[PDB]
Amino acid sequence: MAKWVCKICGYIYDEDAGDPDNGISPGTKFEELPDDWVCPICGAPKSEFEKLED
Ligand SMILES: [Fe+3]
Ligand SMILES: [O+]
Ligand SMILES: [O+]
Ligand SMILES: [O+]
Ligand SMILES: [O+]
């Protein structure tokens, strides 16, 4: 699945890993994250992520 980088701090949201400590099971696509999910390291909103693909 896809990976998305937090442009502020460099954390990688990996769809394969999810973010289970913050309520997100493995296999959850970035588009399916709740509107108020934020980067677990720096607190940046979803707007500040970029998908790692051309
Ligand atoms: Fe971040
Ligand atoms: O990716
Ligand atoms: O995980
Ligand atoms: O899941
Ligand atoms: O936002």
Side-chain angles (χ1 to χ4, degrees):
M1 300 189 64
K3 293 179 175 53
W4 297 70
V5 68
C6 179
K7 289 187 295 186
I8 307 292
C9 76
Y11 172 76
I12 303 291
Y13 177 72
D14 182 355
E15 291 176 349
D16 288 324
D19 182 22
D21 295 338
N22 296 285
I24 308 299
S25 58
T28 303
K29 293 182 170 180
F30 187 82
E31 298 86 354
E32 295 181 292
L33 293 168
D35 286 354
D36 70 315
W37 180 92
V38 294
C39 182
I41 304 306
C42 68
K46 290 180 68 178
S47 61
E48 309 311 288
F49 282 72
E50 190 180 17
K51 190 179 201 180
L52 299 180
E53 82 169 357
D54 159 80

